[PDB]
Amino acid sequence: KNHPMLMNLLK
Amino acid sequence: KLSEEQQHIIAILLDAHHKTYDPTYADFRDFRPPVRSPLSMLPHLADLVSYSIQKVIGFAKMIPGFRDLTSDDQIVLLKSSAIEVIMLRSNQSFTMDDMSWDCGSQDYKYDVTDVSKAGHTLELIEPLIKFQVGLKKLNLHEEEHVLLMAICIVSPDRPGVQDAKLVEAIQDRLSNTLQTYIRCRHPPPGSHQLYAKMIQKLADLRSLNEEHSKQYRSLSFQPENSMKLTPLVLEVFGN
Ligand SMILES: C=C1[C@H](O)CC(=C/C=C2\CCC[C@]3(C)[C@@H]([C@H](C)[C@@H](CCCC)CC[C@H](OC)c4ccc(O)cc4)CC[C@@H]23)C[C@H]1O
């Protein structure tokens, strides 16, 4: 939520 | 005694670190070049930090129970801890001989002047170097090092955490593994108060992190410096 790059590295 | 689970947790953390930390430093060749002028080392060092952020996320995903957290809790834990884990993992390249981080060449050997050339003052730099020296003098086993990195990440008191109880149960398993590890595997006299000392380093990283944020905000205030960062750094540290 406001963090697309971090979220994608998390998945 | 170290249970099978405890030993399995440790085996997993070591491998995770072995997968996310390249002691050859080969990738550094891809960064913008170091230049040794205000903020001459910032592009190179901003690339080093952003690179390191990706490695820390990779490491965090491999922590037992981390994947059980919501996407939100994972993001808030990573966002507050990133800088701290980067200070921690950096201990591997730090050398006491010259008080500098040595990554295999003169070009990738970083001292206090290099850090000042990225826009930092003695206020942050002195406590950072003192931190590296104090950690270095613990002379931790690799097992201890990787446990400390995991415990640092999964701290229930980080801002924005929703499910503190779950984060805390994750950390607790990791702390107990560390405690037992020191007792069963770390011989005296090195083991003396070792757990308490490693926990005091987590307190030191938090202060350092509080300080880092103030400096980071001052840098975020001049958008021509902020321009020199990476997208991941701006996302993770904010802008
Ligand atoms: C692969 C690795 C590790 O991940 C990281 C390595 C070295 C780490 C270093 C040595 C160089 C200086 C580094 C990068 C530090 C940087 C400058 C940080 C120091 C803050 C102290 C509380 C700050 C980084 C931060 O975002 C880029 C920043 C940068 C510029 C600012 O003006 C304000 C903040 C932290 C950690 C430091 C090499 C190697 O061991």
CATH code of residue B190: 1.10.565.10
Residues B60 and B74: their CA atoms lie apart, in Å, by 9
Experimental technique of record: X-ray
Resolution in A: 2.2
Token pair for residue B197?
């000392």
- What is the DSSP pairing of strand B109-110 with strand B94-95? unpaired
Residues of A in contact with B58 (CB under 8 A): 9
Domain that holds residue B37: 1-239
CB atoms within 10 A of CB B168: 15
Buried (b) or exposed (e) across B217-226, using 16+ Cβ within 10 A? eebbeeeebe
Closest chain A residue by Cα to residue B66: A10
For residue B53, give the nearest of B80, B92, B71, B32 by alpha carbon.
B80
Nearest beta carbon to residue B78 from set A1, A4, A6: A6
Token pair for residue B6?
């405890």
Cα B182 → chain centroid: 21
Q: Residues lining ligand 1, judged by CB closer than 6 Å?
A: B 45-46, 48-49, 52, 86-87, 89-90, 92-93, 101, 103, 110, 115, 118-120, 124, 128, 208, 211-212, 215-216, 219, 233
Report how many domains make up chain B. Answer: 1
Q: What secondary structure, in 3-state letters, does chain B show?
A: CCCHHHHHHHHHHHHHHHHHCCCCCHHHHHCCCCCCCCCCCHHHHHHHHHHHHHHHHHHHHCCCCCCCCCHHHHHHHHHHHHHHHHHHHHHHCEECCCCEEECCCCCCEECHHHHHCCCCCHHHHHHHHHHHHHHHHHCCCHHHHHHHHHHHHCCCCCCCCCCHHHHHHHHHHHHHHHHHHHHHHCCCCCCCCHHHHHHHHHHHHHHHHHHHHHHHHHHHHCHHHHCCCCHHHHHHHCC
